[model samples]
Target chain A: MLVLPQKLKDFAKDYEKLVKMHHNVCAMKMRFDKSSDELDPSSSVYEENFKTISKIGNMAKDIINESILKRESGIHKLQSTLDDEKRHLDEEQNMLSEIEFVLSAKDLEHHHHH
Target chain B: MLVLPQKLKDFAKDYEKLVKMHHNVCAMKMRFDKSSDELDPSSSVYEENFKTISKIGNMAKDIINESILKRESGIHKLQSTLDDEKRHLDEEQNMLSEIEFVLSAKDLEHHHHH
Candidate 1:
């Protein structure tokens, strides 16, 4: 097996839990979806379950929202990091080339005997 | 709300579905977890349900495995792409500085009177 970086392993561990978290929330969603479908809005049982369903449904929505937010922020951060790295590399290369040119010119003119 | 790019919106849509899918799977996991906890290993019902549980558990494992694989591959692909882009930019910058040095030199001694 290829060795994984510790950071990646950490990410995978966290990701496993997140996947399970979302899975649990979705299960609730599916159950609620089915319950809502079977329930009559005008029925007394529906009225009784309304608050319960709403409470659970809202909580599920929060879970979904939080996970979505985290994923979005992470993606944005990764993009920014990559952009910064690219810019840094460009600057470093420019500096390197300038130094090379000066050094090459100096060697030719001042060290002609060598 | 800030306008989301179409690609981002698409990702959110798919992510939403994946989240719900995982949620559903986890619900089963929780149920199975509980059932196994209470089940008697030597009982007839236990024997009857064993295969069923194993089958479902394997399926769930497959779901988890597939998601993990996709995430890992996606991350690796992103890193590779970023690396390639950085190399391309580095090459471009080197070419740029070489051009600049030549042009600056050409404009100086040759056009000293102008």
Candidate 2:
């Protein structure tokens, strides 16, 4: 059995969660688009442009609220995944660097004994 | 028939594309995780930790490259959507501001005529 750093395993698990969030965002965006498409300005009133205007105005507000919610709930979490994965990668690199140092030190000691 | 600004409609269309990209990213991440899990460190050598380490090191590099690709192709595109949506929202508000100005100006004209 081969030993592996916990960080690498954690990285994989975290990325799975990130992908799930991305999927969730996609779902929410679909709902938002459906809502936008269903908007019927003509259904408000025949001659009252203000009614149509009011409908579109409220739709825009709704879109803004949805966008803000997506940012806070989904996009921000994806960003956090990126950050966490980056740190894991960095620590993995540091581990490799330490191994290189240990091997070089061992080589120097062997040369001295020779 | 009610008139609506083109920008708002365009915003919805653009968001559809953004959601598609998010879905694409989610697909790629799943593939990445699959590859990561299938990694058999024990298959390399029984006693050679170096071989296992080497496998993981290469995996890290692959993960980095995939992450960069996703950032460039998916996440960045998602960010562009946010920016484009914001601009559309801003322009929509500007259109409303113009309408408000026109209505107030007409109200002043009516007062003058009275």
Candidate 3:
């Protein structure tokens, strides 16, 4: 039986949350630009929008880093599994060759008896 | 009512040219497996960089798709108005609720009364 690991599931949930946050940020930035125009050039609201955009950008960077880490971990585990399987296969092939040699020797002895 | 659309400025210049072609295909498959150091183990740039990384991952799945198609594009338009008039105090709070949901709704409600 096969089962998924809890860590992978958690990573996936986090990844989805990151994507949702990213989309929300995009929508918010567009709104900010529109609102900025109606405000006095020197007002606090104008300044706050700029800060909010920067904050959203930082959050986006964190999400990207998290995604990269998850992918790298998955790739490393897969490579290890592939290496183990290849080693086992090579050993099986050598055993098969030895059995073939013994069978050939038996055939030669039978011919000498005849 | 000043506005800025132009098709969401050509869809934000096409998602930044596909994030520079997916980071140049992840630095060209990490330099094609550090230049495939092992040869007889199987050649051809590791089967042509594993089929050129799925033909550069299907040219990044045809470079992309899907978003709310900017024409009816609002959140982006009205938000700019806030910048033009620092006079409009409520536009920032009203237009950007999700962007910066303040801890208490009443804090904003009391600013003008005082």
Candidate 4:
């Protein structure tokens, strides 16, 4: 008996359902394409619809791109902020070292007085 | 025969092609919907596809909105810029009038001196 990875097995089961949807969509495409071909593609109707579909398509593409851009920009903004935060953390560490040096100085002076 | 606006006539003809597309799409939808019902929507494939579709749909909507917004923002940006230019033009006009007034005041002074 052959063993399968759980993920691949899961995907295959998912594919079984999608395959049906694909078959139906293909069936629709045939009839839809025939209807599209019946008209004069150069005629005003076809041309108008063609233009409208293109317009909507371009609009759709733009909006999707902007959404991604917004997300990426937000991510970048945070990453940049993180860099600044790291610098601030280093500054804090640097200050602690300075305080430690001051303590050493005070201790040395007190030891001489003692 | 009833007369239609040229655009409407064009649209009606376009409608002819779209109507057929609609029929085909409707048939697919019927079969697709039935297939959908064949599965328990709560199952993995159904839920996964549903969520995936929603993500894409929301993304698509975002892109479409962004396209419109980018266009609108471009228009508004130009409009706001135009307002500033108009104000600048008015300021120039006001300066011209003041300069002319200076000349006119010279005339009045000349008259008074005379």
Return the top candidate by lDDT.
Answer: 1
Report the CAPRI category for model 4: incorrect
Query: Model 4: per-residue lDDT, tens digit, B7-106?
Result: 2233334234433443443443344334433434445675465444344434433433333343333334333433443443354344334434543543
lDDT of 2: 0.42
Ranking by lDDT: 1, 2, 4, 3
lDDT of each: 0.46, 0.42, 0.38, 0.39
Number of clashing pairs per prediction, in order? 5, 0, 26, 3
Off by over 4 Å in 4: A1-114, B1-53
Model 4 residue B74 CA deviation (Å) reads 1.7
Per residue, candidate 3 scores C-alpha lDDT tens digits across B29-60 of 34433432232224445445544444543343
lDDT per residue, candidate 1, A1-114, as tens digits? 222223332333433444456566566556556654554554667555655555655555565555554444444444563454345335434433443453354335434433
Every model's TM-score: 0.36, 0.35, 0.31, 0.25
Better of 2 and 3 by TM-score: 2
Question: Model 3, A2-108: lDDT tens per residue?
Answer: 12123323333433443455455455455544543443424557546545544654454444444444444433433343344344335434433433453354345
User: How should the candidates be ordered by TM-score, best one leading?
Assistant: 1, 2, 3, 4
Judged by DockQ cut-offs, is candidate 3 incorrect, acceptable, medium or high? incorrect
Per-residue lDDT tens digits for candidate 4, residues A1-114, read 212223223333423443344344334334334433443444567546544444443443343333334333333433343344344335434433443453355345445545
Q: DockQ (Cα-based) per candidate?
A: 0.01, 0.03, 0.02, 0.01
What's model 3's overall lDDT? 0.38
- CA shift at B36, candidate 4, in angstroms? 15
Tens digits of lDDT, candidate 2, B1-114? 112123322333433443345444445444434443443434454225434444544454454444444333433443454455345445434544544564455445445545
Worst 10 residues of 1 chain A by lDDT: A1-10
The DockQ leader among the candidates is 2
